[PDB]
Amino acid sequence: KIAPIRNEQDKVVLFLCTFSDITAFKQPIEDDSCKGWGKFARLTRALTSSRGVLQQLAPSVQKGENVHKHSRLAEVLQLGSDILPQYKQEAPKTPPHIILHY
Amino acid sequence: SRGIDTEKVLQICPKDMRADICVHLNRKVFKEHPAFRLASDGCLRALAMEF
Amino acid sequence: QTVHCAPGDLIYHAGESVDSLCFVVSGSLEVIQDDEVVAILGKGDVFGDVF
Amino acid sequence: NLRKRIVFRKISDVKREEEERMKRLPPDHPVRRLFQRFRQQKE
Amino acid sequence: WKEATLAQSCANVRALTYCDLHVIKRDALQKVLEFYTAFSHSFSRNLILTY
Amino acid sequence: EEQIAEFKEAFSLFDKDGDGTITTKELGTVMRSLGQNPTEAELQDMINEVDADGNGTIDFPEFLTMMARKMKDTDSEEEIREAFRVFDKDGNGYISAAELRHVMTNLGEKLTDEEVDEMIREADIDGDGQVNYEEFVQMMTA
């Protein structure tokens, strides 16, 4: 997923590309391995981030692929919040309903 | 920094105390960076004195 | 130069460069080599290297 | 003399070595090379 | 320890957040490294610069 | 040999059954979650082949053998690992003067105590009486 970030001077300076692994939840493809199940285990061992609490309810349910993609993309779509500074000297804005004592 | 001078505080103490204080002050780099994981006591102290 | 060393303080850590003859005039010190006692120094003894 | 250091063995170490010897290579090419290099250095 | 010569900086470095730096001069590092040859033989192999 | 220790977490995550081995219910749950619907007989023969016992229980060595076969580590890394394993009688990954004397005597290339000490200090980098993996590979590289 790619989401460029603008700048305070109304320009685009920095790109941002995020990454995610869906190896254990897609069509299995192998090139050269000792065994098919061994290759499957190797592929599954790399998806710990997906298998964690992000989609930990997948084994307890069925046909969860219709929501796994949405769950994975929900975290990535939040990057607009961090894009607000836009690579600029942003002041430490106070939280709402709080008046600075100086 | 308040009213304290780090150089004066370092100079007041003797040599071994100076070396150990400097090693502690640079522990953040020393323990973390992999290039320093093979360092002996003498070289570690001689580097912590100059950092 | 006169140096007062309190008990427990190290003088020459292993691997440090030695560059100073030092004469013991009071008390007593010991040398530790590989976590063992190999010699004991008393009054009127000097340890270092023949510079 | 600080520059000079003495060599010695420990009683516990020699006892353990004797005990291990009481309970007592064709593909050992890296260590064969190590031994050859050590012999060359000592020569 | 490899270049053994000074060079002009080819880019500016600017702070962004409140940072802490641990700088070491070239002369002291070279002296310590040349004193500890065994340490240098691994320091050169293990230290890789980011930029 | 110490890199395989990290597979315990992956094995625990995969084995949601919690009975010490992969259960048929757990396998069904994971295949349903992944979405693919292969043959039950196909999965039965696959698990029978994977498991050494073949009694429907997947053990740690069953995955360990496949992982070791598929690792395909470097030849130099394998050789130095074998050298460390044969040099360390206790198998703790540490090399001592007693171990060095033992292997030298066993191989028959006995050396003097001073020579053994010099060989130890040649590889020793921190000067306290230990021989490390990095120290030995640095010695061997030259």
UniProtKB/Swiss-Prot annotation, chain C:
Subcellular localization(s) per the UniProt record: Cell membrane; Nucleus inner membrane; Cell projection, Dendrite; Cell projection, Axon
Top-rank taxon, per record: Eukaryota
Modification(s) after translation: Channel activity is regulated via tyrosine phosphorylation/dephosphorylation by SRC and PTPN6.
Tissue spec. comment: Detected in cerebellum, at parallel fiber synapses on Purkinje cell spines. Detected in hippocampus neurons (at protein level). Detected in brain, but not in the other tissues tested; expression is highest in granular cells of the dentate gyrus, in hippocampus CA3 pyramidal cells, and in cerebellar granule cells. Detected in pituitary.
Family: Belongs to the potassium channel family. H (Eag) (TC 1.A.1.20) subfamily. Kv10.1/KCNH1 sub-subfamily.
Quaternary structure and partners: Homomultimer. The potassium channel is composed of a homo- or heterotetrameric complex of pore-forming alpha subunits that can associate with modulating beta subunits. Heteromultimer with KCNH5/EAG2. Interacts with ALG10B. Interacts with RABEP1. Interacts (via C-terminus) with CTTN. Interacts (via cytoplasmic region) with Ca(2+)-bound calmodulin.
Domain notes: The segment S4 is probably the voltage-sensor and is characterized by a series of positively charged amino acids at every third position. Conformational changes of voltage-sensor are driven by an electric field generated by a potassium gradient across the membrane.
Curated annotation (Swiss-Prot), chain D:
Tissues in which the protein is found: Detected in cerebellum, at parallel fiber synapses on Purkinje cell spines. Detected in hippocampus neurons (at protein level). Detected in brain, but not in the other tissues tested; expression is highest in granular cells of the dentate gyrus, in hippocampus CA3 pyramidal cells, and in cerebellar granule cells. Detected in pituitary.
Chain segments carrying region Interaction with cyclic nucleotide-binding pocket: 1-2
Localization (cell): Cell membrane; Nucleus inner membrane; Cell projection, Dendrite; Cell projection, Axon
Post-translational modifications: Channel activity is regulated via tyrosine phosphorylation/dephosphorylation by SRC and PTPN6.
Assembly notes: Homomultimer. The potassium channel is composed of a homo- or heterotetrameric complex of pore-forming alpha subunits that can associate with modulating beta subunits. Heteromultimer with KCNH5/EAG2. Interacts with ALG10B. Interacts with RABEP1. Interacts (via C-terminus) with CTTN. Interacts (via cytoplasmic region) with Ca(2+)-bound calmodulin.
Entry remark concerning the domains of this protein: The segment S4 is probably the voltage-sensor and is characterized by a series of positively charged amino acids at every third position. Conformational changes of voltage-sensor are driven by an electric field generated by a potassium gradient across the membrane.
Family: Belongs to the potassium channel family. H (Eag) (TC 1.A.1.20) subfamily. Kv10.1/KCNH1 sub-subfamily.
UniProtKB/Swiss-Prot annotation, chain E:
Origin superkingdom: Eukaryota
Tissue specificity comment: Detected in cerebellum, at parallel fiber synapses on Purkinje cell spines. Detected in hippocampus neurons (at protein level). Detected in brain, but not in the other tissues tested; expression is highest in granular cells of the dentate gyrus, in hippocampus CA3 pyramidal cells, and in cerebellar granule cells. Detected in pituitary.
Subcellular location: Cell membrane; Nucleus inner membrane; Cell projection, Dendrite; Cell projection, Axon
Signal sequence bounds: none
Post-translational modification: Channel activity is regulated via tyrosine phosphorylation/dephosphorylation by SRC and PTPN6.
Family: Belongs to the potassium channel family. H (Eag) (TC 1.A.1.20) subfamily. Kv10.1/KCNH1 sub-subfamily.
Domain notes: The segment S4 is probably the voltage-sensor and is characterized by a series of positively charged amino acids at every third position. Conformational changes of voltage-sensor are driven by an electric field generated by a potassium gradient across the membrane.
Subunit record text: Homomultimer. The potassium channel is composed of a homo- or heterotetrameric complex of pore-forming alpha subunits that can associate with modulating beta subunits. Heteromultimer with KCNH5/EAG2. Interacts with ALG10B. Interacts with RABEP1. Interacts (via C-terminus) with CTTN. Interacts (via cytoplasmic region) with Ca(2+)-bound calmodulin.
UniProtKB/Swiss-Prot annotation, chain F:
Amino acids binding Ca(2+) 3: D88, D90, N92, Y94, E99
GO molecular function, one term: titin binding
GO cellular component, one term: presynaptic cytosol
Keywords recorded for this protein, A-Z: Acetylation, Calcium, Cell projection, Cilium, Cytoplasm, Cytoskeleton, Disease variant, Flagellum, Host-virus interaction, Isopeptide bond, Long QT syndrome, Metal-binding, Methylation, Phosphoprotein, Repeat, Ubl conjugation
Positions that bind Ca(2+) 4: D124, D126, D128, Q130, E135
Pfam families cross-referenced by the UniProt entry: EF-hand_7
Binding residue positions for Ca(2+) 2: D51, D53, N55, T57, E62
Region Necessary and sufficient for interaction with PCP4, annotated ranges: 71-142
InterPro entries per UniProt: CALM/Myosin/TropC-like, EF-hand-dom_pair, EF_Hand_1_Ca_BS, EF_hand_dom
Position of the Glycyl lysine isopeptide (Lys-Gly) (interchain with G-Cter in SUMO2) cross-link: K16
Subcellular location: Cytoplasm, Cytoskeleton, Spindle; Cytoplasm, Cytoskeleton, Spindle pole; Cytoplasm, Cytoskeleton, Microtubule organizing center, Centrosome; Cell projection, Cilium, Flagellum
Cross-link (Glycyl lysine isopeptide (Lys-Gly) (interchain with G-Cter in ubiquitin)): K16
GO BP of this protein: autophagosome membrane docking; calcineurin-mediated signaling; cellular response to interferon-beta; cellular response to type II interferon; detection of calcium ion; G protein-coupled receptor signaling pathway; G2/M transition of mitotic cell cycle; long-term synaptic potentiation
Residue(s) carrying Phosphotyrosine: Y94, Y133
Domain EF-hand: 2-37, 38-73, 75-110, 111-142
Modified residues (N6-methyllysine): K110
General remark: This protein has four functional calcium-binding sites.
Protein name in the entry: Calmodulin-1
Gene that produces this protein: CALM1
